[PDB]
Ligand binder design. Structure first.
Ligand SMILES: CN1CCC(CNc2nc3sc4c(c3c(=O)[nH]2)CCCC4)CC1
Length: 169
C-alpha cells in the first residue's frame, strides 16, 4: 500500500515545458537531465482529502501552492512512497532548493529537486490562530508573510511530490 509509478516526461511534452519554465525562472543556468511525474494513488488521495477539508475551511483562500524541495539522490525512493512524513521546508524559487546542501550532487554531478503541491493555506512568521483556541492552528509557517520565499509544513499529507527534476551544472 502507498505504491507508486515513476513516469518520465518527454521534453516535447507541454507538462514538461510547464515544470521546466518555472524551474528556469531562477535556474536557467542549470542543465536538466530529466523530469518525472511521481504517481502515488494513496498519497494523492490522502493529500486531496486534506485539501477538500482545507478548502471548506479557509474560505476565499487559495490553499495550494507549487514549491520546490531539494534533496539528495538517496532520499528519492523514500519521498516517492512516503511523501514528506515524520517540519519540512519548501522554496518559492527553484534556485534556493538548488543549493548543494539540500540537493547534493551524486557521484555523477546530478542534483535532485522535487516540484511539490503544498497546502500552504493560512500562514504566519506550528503556532495557533488564537491563543484562546489552541486546537485550530496555522496551516504552515513562512519567513515573511507579504514577500514569502519559503514555507514550512508540519502535518502529513500536506505536500504531494508531483515531479522530480534531475539536473546538473
Ligand atoms: C539527507 N538530507 C539531505 C537534505 C534534505 C533537506 N531538504 C531540504 N531542506 C531545505 S531547508 C530550505 C530549503 C530546503 C530544501 O529545499 N530541501 C529550501 C528553502 C530554503 C530553506 C533532507 C535529507
Amino acid at each position: 500500500q502507498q505504491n507508486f509509478c515513476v513516469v518520465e516526461l518527454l521534453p516535447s511534452d507541454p507538462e514538461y515545458n510547464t515544470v521546466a519554465s518555472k524551474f528556469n525562472q531562477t535556474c536557467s543556468h542549470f542543465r536538466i537531465e530529466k523530469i518525472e511525474r511521481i504517481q502515488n494513488p494513496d498519497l494523492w488521495n490522502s493529500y486531496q482529502a486534506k485539501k477538500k477539508t482545507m478548502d471548506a475551511k479557509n474560505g476565499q483562500t487559495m490553499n495550494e501552492k507549487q514549491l520546490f524541495h531539494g534533496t539528495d539522490a538517496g532520499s528519492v525512493p523514500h519521498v516517492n512512497r512516503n511523501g514528506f512524513n515524520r517540519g519540512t521546508y519548501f522554496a518559492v524559487n527553484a534556485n534556493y532548493s538548488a543549493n548543494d546542501t539540500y540537493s547534493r550532487p551524486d557521484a555523477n554531478g546530478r542534483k535532485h529537486v522535487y516540484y511539490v503541491r503544498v497546502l500552504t493555506g493560512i500562514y504566519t512568521h506550528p503556532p495557533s490562530k488564537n491563543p484562546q483556541n489552541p486546537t485550530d492552528l496555522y496551516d504552515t509557517v513562512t519567513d515573511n508573510v507579504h514577500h514569502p520565499s519559503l514555507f514550512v509544513a508540519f502535518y502529513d499529507y500536506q505536500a504531494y511530490p508531483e515531479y522530480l527534476i534531475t539536473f546538473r551544472k
